[PDB]
Amino acid sequence: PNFSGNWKIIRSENFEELLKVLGVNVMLRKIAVAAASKPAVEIKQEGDTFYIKTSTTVRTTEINFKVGEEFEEQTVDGRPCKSLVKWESENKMVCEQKLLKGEGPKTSWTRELTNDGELILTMTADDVVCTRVYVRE
Numbered sequence: 758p759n760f761s762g763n764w765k766i767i768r769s770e771n772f773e774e775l776l777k778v779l780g781v782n783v784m785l786r787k788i789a790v791a792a793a794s795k796p797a798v799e800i801k802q803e804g805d806t807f808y809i810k811t812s813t814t815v816r817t818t819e820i821n822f823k824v825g826e827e828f829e830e831q832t833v834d835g836r837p838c839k840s841l842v843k844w845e846s847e848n849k850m851v852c853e854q855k856l857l858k859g860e861g862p863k864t865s866w867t868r869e870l871t872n873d874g875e876l877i878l879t880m881t882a883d884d885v886v887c888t889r890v891y892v893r894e
């Protein structure tokens with residue numbers, strides 16, 4: 758699979774609900790939800806090596822990882838974590854996250870390329886799942 762490209766969002770479900778489970782307060786949620794509705798996403802893939810940049814007016818994240826090798830990033834609400842990505846299937850990667858310090862909901866994320874050429878991102882916090890769908894610009 759080739760995840761490479763500049764992606765634009767076409768659907769977002771359950772984002773605020775995910776933030777609620779993570780403990781983000783009402784006003785911060787309001788800010789986050791508005792900014793997250795129009796992200797600029799850039800993915801560069803070279804084999805099993807990935808670079809993913811997600812940008813919004815209030816927060817930009819850039820992660821670099823190799824599938825199967827542990828790395829450090831942050832949860833959606835901004836807490837440091839150790840992550841490990843694996844191929845669940847040929848077109849789907851799954852990432853398990855572990856908080857470096859403290860306790861909180863168990864979080865994870867998955868990215869998959871669908872048969873129609875789109876990209877589905879899921880983010881999980883305990884039992885709440887956020888689903889976002891993108892298409893290349």
Ligand SMILES: CC1=C(/C=C/C(C)=C/C=C/C(C)=C/C(=O)O)C(C)(C)CCC1
Pocket residue numbers: 776781785788789790792793796811812813815816833834835878889
């Ligand atoms: C949670 C949160 C914040 C914003 C988060 C944003 C904006 C997340 C965007 C995620 C995207 C854009 C994911 C994707 O689509 O891959 C701010 C900075 C207000 C601080 C309080 C907690």
